[PDB]
Amino acid sequence: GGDTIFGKIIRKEIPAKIIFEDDRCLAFHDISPQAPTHFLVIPKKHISQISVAEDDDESLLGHLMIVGKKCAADLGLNKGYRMVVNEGSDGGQSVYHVHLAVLGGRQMHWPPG
Amino acid sequence: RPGGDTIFGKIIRKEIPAKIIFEDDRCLAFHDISPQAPTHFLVIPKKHISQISVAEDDDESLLGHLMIVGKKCAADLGLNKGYRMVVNEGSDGGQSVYHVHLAVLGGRQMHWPPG
Ligand SMILES: Nc1ncnc2c1ncn2[C@@H]1O[C@H](COP(=O)(O)OP(=O)(O)OP(=O)(O)OP(=O)(O)OC[C@H]2O[C@@H](n3cnc4c(N)ncnc43)[C@H](O)[C@@H]2O)[C@@H](O)[C@H]1O
C-alpha cells in the first residue's frame, strides 16, 4: 500500500482519528486542520497522484467523493463544505498518495488558495 | 430539460456560449469566466445534480469521471507543474450555481489553506 505516511495510517502502523473505513478507502481527520472540520478520504490502493489515475479507477475516485459526502453529513456540515484534491508542486500536494480533503464548519473563501 | 435550469444547463444545450475544452455523453469541460488562476476551468455532469450533498450512490462512476476528465484536460492544457481540484458545496463551500461542478485551477502556485 505504499511508502508514505498515509500508507502507514492505512496499515494501522501509526494512529489517526478514523471516521470511516471500508474495503477500499479510509477517512480520517487531518493532523493539520485548516477548518473546524477538516478530514481526508484516501483510497487503499496507492495512487500517487491524480494525474496518474487510470481509467479503471474511475468509480473508485467517485467512491471517495461519495464517502466524503456521507462523512460530511455525519459530522454535521449542513451549511456546506469544500472538497479539494491537490496535484503536484503548484497544487500544493503534501503527500504523494491521492487524498480528497473535505473542509467545513466555517465560511470557505475565494480564491481557494 | 437535459442539463437542468441553471446557466450550466443552458451551456450544455448550447443556448449560451462557452469556451469548451472537452465534451462527451456524460460531462462537459469549459473555461471559467472569472478565472482565479492563469488556467481555471470547470467539469460538470450533463445530468443535473444540484450539489454534491444530494448525489446518489449510483452517481459514483459519474463523479469519478469528472475527476478523470479534469486530470486529462489539465494535462492537455499543459499544467505539468500541478493544479488544484475544488468542489464547492453549499453556502459555506462558496457554491453559487446549484449544478455540481469540479473546478481545476493551475498555472501558478496554489496556497494553503484552500480558502
Ligand atoms: N457562463 C459562465 N461560464 C463559465 N463560467 C461561469 C459562468 N458563470 C459562472 N461561472 C463560474 O462558475 C464557477 C462556480 O460558480 P459559483 O461560484 O457557484 O457562482 P458565481 O458565478 O461565482 O456567482 P457569485 O459568486 O458572484 O454570487 P453573487 O455575487 O452574484 O450573489 C451572491 C449570492 O446571492 C444570491 N442571490 C442572487 N440574487 C439574489 C437575490 N435577489 N436575493 C437573495 N440572494 C440572491 C446568489 O445566488 C449568490 O449566491 C465560478 O467561478 C464562475 O466564475
Say how many Å lie between the CA of residue B40 and the centre of ligand 1. Answer: 16
For B25-72, the DSSP string reads SSEEEEE-SS-SSSEEEEEEESS--S-GGG--GGGHHHHHHHHHHHHH
Say how many Å lie between the CA of residue B58 and the centre of ligand 1. Answer: 28
Q: Which of B43, B85, B96 to mutate to test the interface with A (most CBs of A within 10 A)?
A: B85
- Asked if residue B83 lies in contact with residue B105, where contact means CB atoms within 8 angstroms, the answer is yes
Q: Give the C-alpha separation, B19 to B90, whole Å.
A: 26
Resolution in A: 0.9
Of B107, B101, B80, B90, whose CA–CA distance to B12 is shortest?
A: B101
Q: Give the C-alpha separation, B1 to A102, whole Å.
A: 32
Which structural domain, as residue segments, surrounds residue A37? 1-113
Pick B36's closest partner by Cβ from A35, A80, A111: A111
What residues in A contact B94, CB-CB < 8 Å?
80, 82, 107-110, 112
Helix A58-74 with B60-76: angle, nearest 10 deg: 120
Q: Give the C-alpha separation, A12 to A87, whole Å.
A: 25
User: CA angle at residue B3 from B19 to A112, to 5 degrees?
Assistant: 55
Q: What Å distances lie between residue A27 and A3, A8, A108, B50, B59, CA to CA? A: 18, 14, 21, 24, 19
Q: How many domains does chain A have?
A: 1
Say how many Å lie between the CA of residue A26 and the centre of ligand 1. Answer: 34
Q: Give the C-alpha separation, B34 to B36, whole Å.
A: 7
The answer to whether the bond into B35 is cis (omega within 30° of 0) is no
Q: How was this structure determined?
A: X-ray
Of B101, B42, B45, whose CA–CA distance to B77 is shortest?
A: B42
- Cβ of A85 within 8 Å of Cβ of B81? The answer is no
Task: Record the cell numbers describing residue A13, joined without a space.
Answer: 502502523
Q: Is there an atom of ligand 1 within 6 Å of B32 CB?
A: yes
Q: Give the C-alpha separation, A86 to A96, whole Å.
A: 10
Beta bridge mates, A43: A25
What residues in B contact A91, CB-CB < 8 Å?
82-84, 106, 110
- Asked if residue B21 lies in contact with residue B73, where contact means CB atoms within 8 angstroms, the answer is yes
Task: Record the cell numbers describing residue B74, joined without a space.
Answer: 489539465
Pick B82's closest partner by Cβ from A57, A90, A111: A90
- What's A8's domain CATH number? 3.30.428.10
- Asked if residue A84 lies in contact with residue A15, where contact means CB atoms within 8 angstroms, the answer is no
Of A88, A90, A102, whose CA–CA distance to A50 is shortest?
A: A88
